[PDB]
Design a protein around this ligand. Structure first.
Ligand SMILES: Nc1ncnc2c1ncn2[C@@H]1O[C@H](COP(=O)(O)OP(=O)(O)O)[C@@H](O)[C@H]1O
Ligand SMILES: Nc1ncnc2c1ncn2[C@@H]1O[C@H](COP(=O)(O)OP(=O)(O)O)[C@@H](O)[C@H]1O
Ligand SMILES: Nc1ncnc2c1ncn2[C@@H]1O[C@H](COP(=O)(O)OP(=O)(O)O)[C@@H](O)[C@H]1O
Ligand SMILES: [Mg+2]
Ligand SMILES: [Mg+2]
Ligand SMILES: [Mg+2]
Lengths: 538, 548, 541
C-alpha cells in the first residue's frame, strides 16, 4: 500500500514492529543492566573532541549518545523526564519497560490480544496505588532526626560513589538539608543549594560552607583581602560608562573645552559613588575593626575601582542572577537597585569574609552568619570528569532526600516494594477485581516483571540470582503466620536477606509512583503499535 | 555461512560508537596502552634522564624531561592514558614537583594490578587494598622524617633545597645553577625577623627572561627586571646619584579624548588660530605639575602621542612601553608605586624609588635594566639566563619554575620536613608496608603486598638509567634494611640509597654529606593523586568511545 | 529516530528475496495488477477483436489475436501471471481451441472474487465452492446439447464446425478459408462406406505452405505438398508416362562408405588405371537396377554426389534433397512408399505411385508441385496461402492449425458434440447456477453466486467490440430467455442490433462441448491455484 504511493519508503508491520520494540528494549536494557545497583560498573563517555565525563546516571548515558532507533528515543524521553523533575529512578524506568515488553511478548506469540493485556496492566497499576497507602509508613518531621536523614543520604551516594566518598560527602548534604526545614515548611532546592566547580587537592577534601561562596575577588592589590565584619550592599546599577541612547558628539571647540567635557564622564559615576560615601559615613564607627563590601550584578569601570580601594571597600563585579537572589538569605539584609534611597536596615551582616587564590583565579569565601537562611556546597575535585561525577551524585542525592521532607511518608527499598507487590498481585482474589476474560496472564506478566529488578542487583555481585530468593520466599511464608510485620531486603555483601529498616536503605515516595506510571504508559503504547514507517519531505 | 549477521540490534546507537567491556582482555590492553608511554617515562626520571623531542603540527618544538610538560602536546586517543595526563597536570599546578613520580608509580600500580586481576581478585577489593595501603603510607611518611630548615633565609640551607630539585631537569654543573636561585629567593622574600608577621611568597615574582648568546657561566642575578624595549627620545646612562623618582600611569600619555564622537568644531577664524596652540599649551601645562615633582622616568601603559613625547624628553624624562596588564603590574611591585589613571600630579608617597636605569648590549638588541642596590630592597627579581640553544632555555626556565615552586612548599606547612632521597624513602616503605600486610588478615593481603612491589621502580629506574645492572645493584641495597634496627640507638642505615656515579655495589655514601633530600608535601599529594589515577582506571570495567 | 533497525531477520534470507504475503495485501496486489493483461485478451476476443503486435527480443515480429501465441513471447516478471500463461498453453497443445476463454474466464474469477475476499469470506471455502460449482457445470452442459452429429464425413456438415472457428479469427474471410480447410479434411479422410473404430488423425496431416503475394481468393487446394526448392537435370514430361514410381532413400546415392574413415591404397599403377573406371562401374551396377523397374523419381535426404546425379540425368530421373527429416516422411505418405536406407533394388510392393510432378512459379520463386489426380492418398494435404504480407499469413497458419486441431478434438474422443454459441449457453449457465445456489444452504452460497457472475463477460465482450451499450442489450437478452426457442437466443453483431435478438440457425454459429469443458476445468484450476497461494517468494534477477 505504501510502495505504489511513495517511490521510496520502509515499512514494518504485524511481526517486525513487535520484534523491533522488544529487541530494542532488550538491547537498551542490557546497556543499563550492569549499572544498576551499588556494585555496578562505571561508564565513561568520550566524544570526538576528546573530553572525558564519568557517571553511572542513565540520563547522562542517554542524553549524550545519539540513538537511531524509534523505540529507544521514547525510552530516552521517559527516563529523562522522570529524572528531570524527581531526580531519581532513571534506570528503574528503563528496566520496567525493558522487562515488561519481553514478559508480555511471550504471550503475544501465544495469541493474546495487546489490548486486553494492557488493560490488565492498567487495572493492576491501580492496585499498586492502593498498595502504596498501606505499604508506606508515617514519619513526623517535628522530631528533627538527623540520623534518619543520614541514612537516606547514603542510599543514593553508595550507589554512585564508593564508601570513601560517601562518608565524607554525606554530612555535607545533611548540613545543607538541615537548614531547609523551617516554620513555613516551604522547600527550595534550586535557589538554596548550588554546585560550583573548583580544581583543587582531591575529591575527598569537599567541605561545607554555611555562607555564599563567590568565584571572584578583589582586582586591585591594595584593596583588603580579609574582612572581619563586612556589611554587604546589593546594587544592580552599572557603574561603568553608558553610551546614552543616540547621544553623539561632545562637540568641542577649543582644546581646553575638550578635556572640560571629558571630565563629565566622571560626574555621572561620582554622583553614584557619593551616595556610597554618604552611606559609609553613617556606619563609619569602628572602621578598622569593621568593614564594607559592595557586590554588583553588572560590570564596574576600572576608573572607579581606585575609589573603593582608597576607602578600603571590597569590590566584586559581574555576579550571577542566582547569587543576587541568595545574599538576602545568607546575610539577612535587603536588596537595592537605585542609589537614591538608602538606609542602614538593608545592609546585611557577616562574621568572616576572606579570599583564597590558586593560579590565576581567585575565590571569595563568606561564612559565620548569625541566622543564615541558605548555604552552599563547594565540591572539590581533581579532573573534569571527577566534577561531573560529583555533579550527578549531588544532583541526584539532593533531590532524593529533599522529597522525603515534602511528604510525611517514605518507602523502604531493597526489593521490598517489588517483592511485596509480587505476593499481592499473585494472591489477591480476582473476583474483587473488575477484569475478566483473558486478563489472567496480564496480572501475572506485570507481577512477574517486577522480580527482575532486585535480582539485577545480584547480577552485579556474581551470585546465583534464583537461589538468593529461596530463603526470601520462605521468610515471607512464615512471617504472615508468625504475627510480626517485617520487611525483607537484599544484601549483596553476604548474599542473604536483610531488613532495610535497621540497615538504613530507603527510597523516596514519588520515585516508584512516577516510575511505574511512566513505564506503564510507555510500555502499553509500544505494545499497541503494530506498524512502523518513515515518510516526509527532505 | 559466507557472512555473519554482523552484530544485530547495533542500530540502537550510531555506527561510530564502540563499547569496551572488562572481558576479552581489554583491561590488560589498557594496561598495555599505559605501558607504551610509561616506558618513555623510564628514560626520563632521575638526574641521568633523557629529554624528548616533540614536534607539533605547527612546528613549535619543546625538548624536555618532565612528564607533565611533554603530555600537554601529545594528542591521546586512549581515555585511561588521559587520566595520567590530567593527574600530572594537577601535580604541576598545585605543587610543581614530582610529576614523573605520578606517572611512574601509577603506571606500575596498573602493572602489578595486571597480575592481581589475572589471579582472580575482584575490582572492589583492589580499591580497598590500595586505600588501606595509602592510609598507612601517608602515616609513615610523617614518622620517618628527619631534619628541618627553621630559617627562611640562609646561604647553606638553600643549597639543600634547590640543588636536589634542579638535579633532575638539566643537571649540568651544580653550583652555577643553584646560586642563581638562592640569590634571587633572598631578594623577594619579606624576611622581617622578630615581628610575628605571616610569611608570603608568590610564584609569579621570580621570572626568567630568555636571551640568546653567551654561556651558562655568564648568567647574572638582576635585582629588578628587564624588557627588550627602545627609548624613544634619547638614551641616558644616568650617572647622576641622589636617586630619581618613578611615576606609573596606566592610561596613555596623551589628551583624554572623548569616548563618544570626539570631533573638532571651529565656527570662526579666532578658534582656528587658538586651537593649534591650545593643544600645545594644554599638554605643556600638564607636564609642569609632573616635572616639578622631580620625576625622570614614566612607564606608559599604551601608545603615547608625539606632542606629549616632545615635552617629556625636553626635561629628560624616560618613556617605557608596557602594552599589557600584567607587564605593568609586575613593575609596580619593584619600586612599590601606586598607579593612578589621572594625568595630574603623582602623589609623593606613591612615587617609586629607582636609582639607575641602564641600557647595554646583552643579546645584540636594546634592553632596559632596573637594577636596585642593597638599600631600599625590592621584590619580583629576574634572572638573566644566557644560553646557545633556544630549546635549552625553555627547559632550564621551567626548572626555575620547579625550584620556585619548591620554595612555595615552605610557606604553607609548619616547616621544611625533609626526607632522605635517592630511593631511600621508597625502599623504606617497602619493608613497612610489607610488615603491614602481615599484621592485617583477609584476602586484601596480596593487594598490600603488590603495593610494596610497585615502589621498587624508583631504585630500579635510577639503576637502569645510570648504566648499571639492576640485578646486582638492587639486592645489594636490600642488605642494609635486612639488618634491621638492633638494640643500639642512632642507627644510620636509613640514608642508604642508589648512586648514579661512582663506587661499586652502589649503596650511596649516604644521601647525607651529598646534601640531597625530598619534600614531604610533594610525596603526600603525589602518592594521593597517583593512587587516584590507578583507582579511576581499575574501578571502571566498561569504556565507551565514539568516532574511533 | 532517523535510521530504522533494518528488520533484524535480515540475517535471514538475502536481499534479493522478496516476500509478498497476505494480510500485508498480496491478493489485492495480484488480482489487480493482472487486470492490465486481462484487458489485452478481452479486447482481442470475438470476431471483431483486435490483434496485438508482439516484437520479441530477437526481432521476429508477430501479430496474433489469440492468447497462447502472445503470452509465449511476453517475458513476464510477475509469477502469478505465469500460472495463467502455461495454463493457456495446455489448451493450445492438447485441444488447440479456447486459449482466449481460458485467459478470460480464469482472470474474471479472480476479478469477481474481489467481493468475497473483501467481505471476509474464508479462502479455503472459496476453493471448495468453485470445485463443487465446477462439477455441476460439467454435468449440466450435457443436457443443453442439440448438435448430436454421427456422420462427420461430408463437407457440408463441417460448415457448422469449421466456419464458426474461422469466423472468429479474421471474420471477413469465411467461405474461402472454410473451403480450403473442409476440402483438405475430405482429402485426408479415406473413401469408405463406413470408417469406424476411431480412425487415426493428427495435426501434421494438413500442412501450410506460405507463398508471398496474391489475393486470398486465388488460393487453391493441393493434395501433395510444395517445397521451395530448385529441381536439377531435366524438364518433366507432365503427361507421357501417366504415373511415376517414387523411391525415397534415407542414405545418399553414392558408393557405400563406412562410418570409420578410410582412404585409397594403391600398391602399383595397374590399380591406378582401373580406379577411374571402377567407381563408374560400381555405381552403374547399382544404378542400372533402379532404372529397370522404371523408378522415375528418387529422393535422397543427404547430399547427392555428382557421379550419381550424372547417371540419373541421361535416363531422366527426378532428384530432390529434402534435408529436414520431419518433412521427408510426409512425402512417403503421399506416394504410399516406405523409407529404404539400403540401396538394394526397387520392389513393386514397397514402391508407391504418383500421377505427375510439374514445376512453375506461384509467387515468383520456382517450386516443385506434387499434385496428383485419381491417385490414392492417406492422411496428407496442403493449403497454398496467397497473401500480401508475411505477417498476415502467419495468423492464417495458426487459424488453420486451430481449425484442424478441432478435427483432432472431435475424432479422437467418441463425441465432440456442438453447443449453442454467440452468447447463448453462457447466459443459460447463469440461470442454472443461480437456481443451484439456493438448493444448498450454507456459507458457500456466496461463492456459487459469484461463480455465475464471472460468465457475464462472454456476451458483453462481443457487445463492447461491436460498439454497443452493455446496459441495453445484455439485460434485454435476459427477457428473451423467459419462458425450444429460448435456448437459441444470442448476441447480434450488426447495424440492426438495436433489438439484440438474432437466431443462431440463420448463420449456424456453434461451439464444441469438449473445448468448453476443458477450458472451464483449466480456468477453474488456474483460479484455484492463485486463490490458494498466500506467500510469493522472489529471487534476485
Ligand atoms: N546499598 C544498597 N543495598 C540495597 N539496595 C540498594 C543499595 N543501594 C541501592 N539500592 C537499591 O537500588 C535501587 C536503585 O537505586 P538508585 O540508583 O537510587 O535509582 P536508579 O538506579 O533508578 O538511579 C533502589 O531501589 C535501591 O533500593
Ligand atoms: N645526584 C643524585 N644522587 C642520588 N639520587 C638523586 C640524585 N639526583 C636526584 N636523585 C633522586 O632522583 C629522584 C628524581 O626525582 P624527580 O621525580 O625527577 O624530581 P622532579 O619532580 O623535580 O622531576 C629524586 O627524588 C632524588 O631522590
Ligand atoms: N456471425 C456471428 N454471429 C454471432 N456470433 C459470432 C459470429 N461469429 C463469431 N461469433 C462468436 O464469437 C465467439 C468467439 O469465440 P472464440 O474465443 O473464437 O472461441 P474459442 O475461445 O473456443 O477459441 C464464438 O463463441 C462465436 O459464438
Ligand atoms: Mg538513584
Ligand atoms: Mg625534583
Ligand atoms: Mg476459436
Amino acid at each position: 500500500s505504501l510502495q505504489l504511493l511513495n517511490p521510496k519508503a520502509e515499512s514494518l508491520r504485524r511481526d517486525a514492529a513487535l520484534k523491533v520494540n522488544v529487541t530494542s528494549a532488550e538491547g537498551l536494557q542490557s546497556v543499563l543492566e550492569t549499572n544498576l545497583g551499588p556494585k555496578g560498573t562505571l561508564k565513561m563517555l568520550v566524544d570526538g573532541a576528546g573530553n572525558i565525563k564519568l557517571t553511572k546516571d542513565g540520563k547522562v548515558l542517554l542524553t549524550e549518545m545519539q540513538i537511531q532507533s524509534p523505540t529507544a528515543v521514547l525510552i530516552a524521553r521517559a527516563a529523562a523526564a522522570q529524572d528531570e523533575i524527581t531526580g531519581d529512578g532513571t534506570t528503574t524506568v528503563v528496566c520496567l519497560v525493558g522487562e515488561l515488553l519481553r514478559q508480555a511478548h511471550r504471550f503475544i506469540q501465544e495469541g493474546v490480544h495487546p489490548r486486553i493485556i494492557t488493560d490488565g496492566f492498567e487495572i493492576a497499576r491501580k492496585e499498586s496505588m492502593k498498595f502504596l497507602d498501606e505499604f508506606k509508613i508515617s514519619k513526623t518531621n517535628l522530631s528533627n532526626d538527623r540520623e534518619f536523614l543520614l541514612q537516606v543520604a547514603r542510599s543514593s551516594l553508595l550507589t554512585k560513589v564508593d564508601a570513601d566518598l560517601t562518608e565524607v560527602l554525606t554530612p555535607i548534604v545533611t548540613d545543607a538539608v538541615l537548614s531547609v526545614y523551617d516554620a513555613q515548611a516551604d522547600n527550595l532546592d534550586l535557589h538554596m543549594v548550588e554546585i560550583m566547580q573548583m580544581q583543587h587537592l582531591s575529591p575527598k577534601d569537599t567541605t561545607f560552607i554555611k555562607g555564599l561562596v563567590l568565584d571572584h575577588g578583589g582586582r586591585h592589590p591594595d584593596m583588603p583581602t580579609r574582612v572581619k565584619n563586612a556589611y554587604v550592599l546589593i546594587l544592580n546599577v552599572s557603574l561603568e560608562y553608558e553610551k546614552t541612547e543616540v547621544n553623539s558628539g561632545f562637540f568641542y571647540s577649543s582644546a581646553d573645552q575638550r578635556d572640560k567635557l571629558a571630565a563629565s564622564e566622571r560626574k555621572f559615576v561620582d554622583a553614584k559613588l557619593k551616595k556610597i560615601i554618604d552611606l559609609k559615613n553613617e556606619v563609619c564607627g569602628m572602621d578598622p575593626d569593621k568593614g564594607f563590601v559592595i557586590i554588583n550584578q553588572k560590570g564596574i569601570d576600572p576608573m572607579s575601582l581606585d575609589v573603593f580601594a582608597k576607602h578600603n571597600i571590597l569590590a566584586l563585579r559581574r555576579a550571577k542572577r542566582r547569587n543576587m537572589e541568595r545574599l538576602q538569605l545568607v546575610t539577612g539584609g535587603e536588596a537595592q537597585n537605585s542609589v537614591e534611597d538608602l538606609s542602614p536596615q538593608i545592609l546585611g551582616f557577616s562574621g568572616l569574609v576572606y579570599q583564597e587564590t590558586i593560579g590565576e583565579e581567585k575565590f571569595t569565601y563568606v561564612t559565620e552568619n548569625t541566622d543564615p537562611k541558605s548555604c552552599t556546597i563547594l565540591i572539590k575535585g581533581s579532573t573534569h570528569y571527577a566534577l561531573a561525577q560529583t555533579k550527578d551524585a549531588v544532583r541526584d542525592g539532593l533531590r532524593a532526600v529533599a522529597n522525603v521532607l515534602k511528604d510525611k511518608n517514605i518507602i523502604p527499598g531493597a526489593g521490598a516494594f517489588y517483592i511485596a507487590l509480587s505476593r499481592y498481585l499473585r494472591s489477591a482474589n480476582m473476583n474483587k477485581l473488575g477484569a475478566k476474560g483473558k486478563t489472567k496472564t496480564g496480572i501475572e506478566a506485570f507481577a512477574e516483571a517486577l522480580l527482575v529488578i532486585p535480582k539485577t542487583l545480584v547480577k552485579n555481585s556474581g551470585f546465583d540470582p534464583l537461589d538468593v530468593l529461596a530463603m526470601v520466599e520462605d521468610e515471607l511464608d512464615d512471617a504472615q503466620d508468625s504475627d510480626e510485620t517485617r520487611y525483607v531486603g537484599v544484601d549483596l555483601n553476604i548474599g542473604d536477606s536483610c531488613d532495610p529498616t535497621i540497615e538504613g536503605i530507603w527510597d523516596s515516595y514519588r520515585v516508584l509512583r512516577n516510575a511505574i506510571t511512566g513505564a506503564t504508559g510507555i510500555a502499553s503504547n509500544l505494545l499497541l503499535c503494530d506498524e512502523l514507517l518513515r515518510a516526509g519531505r527532505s | 555461512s559466507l557472512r555473519l549477521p554482523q552484530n544485530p540490534n547495533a542500530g540502537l546507537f550510531k555506527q561510530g560508537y564502540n563499547s569496551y567491556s572488562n572481558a576479552d582482555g581489554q583491561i590488560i590492553k589498557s594496561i598495555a596502552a599505559i605501558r607504551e608511554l610509561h616506558q618513555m617515562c623510564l628514560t626520563s626520571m632521575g638526574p641521568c634522564g633523557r629529554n624528548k623531542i616533540i614536534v607539533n603540527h605547527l612546528g613549535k618544538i619543546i625538548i624536555t624531561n618532565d612528564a607533565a610538560t611533554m603530555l600537554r602536546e601529545l594528542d591521546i586517543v586512549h581515555p585511561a592514558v588521559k587520566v595520567l595526563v590530567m593527574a600530572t597536570e594537577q601535580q604541576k599546578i598545585d605543587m610543581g614537583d614530582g610529576t614523573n613520580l605520578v606517572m611512574i608509580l601509577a603506571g606500575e600500580l596498573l602493572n602489578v594490578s595486571e597480575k592481581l586481576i589475572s589471579m582472580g581478585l575482584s575490582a572492589v577489593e583492589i580499591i580497598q587494598g590500595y586505600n588501606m595501603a595509602r592510609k598507612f603510607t601517608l602515616k609513615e611518611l610523617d614518622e620517618m622524617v628527619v631534619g628541618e630548615i627553621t630559617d627562611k633565609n640562609d646561604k647553606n640551607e638553600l643549597l639543600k633545597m634547590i640543588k636536589p630539585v634542579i638535579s633532575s631537569k638539566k643537571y649540568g654543573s651544580e653550583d652555577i645553577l643553584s646560586e642563581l636561585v638562592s640569590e634571587a629567593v633572598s631578594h623577594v622574600l619579606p624576611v622581617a625577623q622578630q615581628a610575628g608577621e605571616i610569611p608570603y611568597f608568590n610564584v609569579d615574582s621570580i621570572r626568567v627572561v630568555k636571551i640568546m648568546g653567551g654561556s651558562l657561566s655568564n648568567s647574572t642575578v638582576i635585582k629588578g627586571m628587564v624588557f627588550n624595549r627602545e627609548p624613544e627620545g634619547h638614551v641616558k646612562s644616568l650617572s647622576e646619584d641622589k636617586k630619581h623618582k618613578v611615576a606609573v600611569f596606566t592610561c596613555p600619555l596623551d589628551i583624554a579624548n572623548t569616548e563618544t564622537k570626539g570631533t573638532v568644531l571651529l565656527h570662526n577664524a579666532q578658534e582656528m588660530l587658538d586651537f593649534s596652540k591650545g593643544e600645545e599649551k594644554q599638554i605643556d601645562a600638564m607636564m609642569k605639575e609632573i616635572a616639578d615633582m622631580g620625576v625622570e622616568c614614566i612607564v606608559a601603559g599604551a601608545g603615547v602621542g608625539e606632542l606629549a613625547l616632545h615635552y617629556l624628553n625636553r626635561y629628560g624624562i624616560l618613556v617605557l612601553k608596557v602594552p599589557s596588564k600584567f607587564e605593568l603590574r609586575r613593575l609596580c611591585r619593584v619600586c612599590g608605586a601606586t598607579p593612578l589613571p589621572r594625568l595630574g600630579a603623582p602623589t609623593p608617597e606613591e612615587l617609586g624609588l629607582v636609582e639607575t636605569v641602564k641600557t647595554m648590549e646583552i643579546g645584540g638588541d636594546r634592553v632596559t635594566v632596573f637594577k636596585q642596590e642593597q638599600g631600599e630592597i625590592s621584590r619580583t627579581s629576574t634572572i638573566i639566563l644566557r644560553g646557545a640553544t633556544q630549546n635549552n632555555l625553555d627547559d632550564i626556565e621551567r626548572a626555575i619554575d620547579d625550584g620556585v615552586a619548591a620554595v612555595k612548599g615552605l610557606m604553607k606547612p609548619s616547616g621544611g620536613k625533609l626526607l632522605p632521597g635517592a630511593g631511600a624513602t621508597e625502599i623504606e616503605l617497602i619493608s613497612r608496608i610489607t610488615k603491614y600486610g602481615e599484621r592485617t588478615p583477609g584476602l586484601l593481603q596480596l593487594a598490600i603486598k603488590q603495593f610494596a612491589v610497585a615502589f621498587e621502580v624508583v631504585p630500579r629506574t635510577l639503576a637502569e638509567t645510570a648504566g648499571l645492572d639492576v640485578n646486582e645493584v638492587l639486592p645489594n641495597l636490600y642488605a642494609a634494611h635486612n639488618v634491621t634496627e638492633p638494640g643500639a640507638v642512632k642507627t644510620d642505615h636509613l640514608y642508604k640509597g642508589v648512586d648514579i656515579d661512582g663506587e661499586s655495589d652502589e649503596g650511596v655514601k649516604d644521601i647525607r654529606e651529598e646534601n640531597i633530600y625530598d619534600m614531604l608535601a610533594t610525596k603526600k599529594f603525589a602518592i594521593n593523586v597517583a593512587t587516584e589515577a590507578a583507582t579511576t582506571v581499575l574501578s571502571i570495567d566498561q569504556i565507551i568511545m565514539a568516532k574511533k
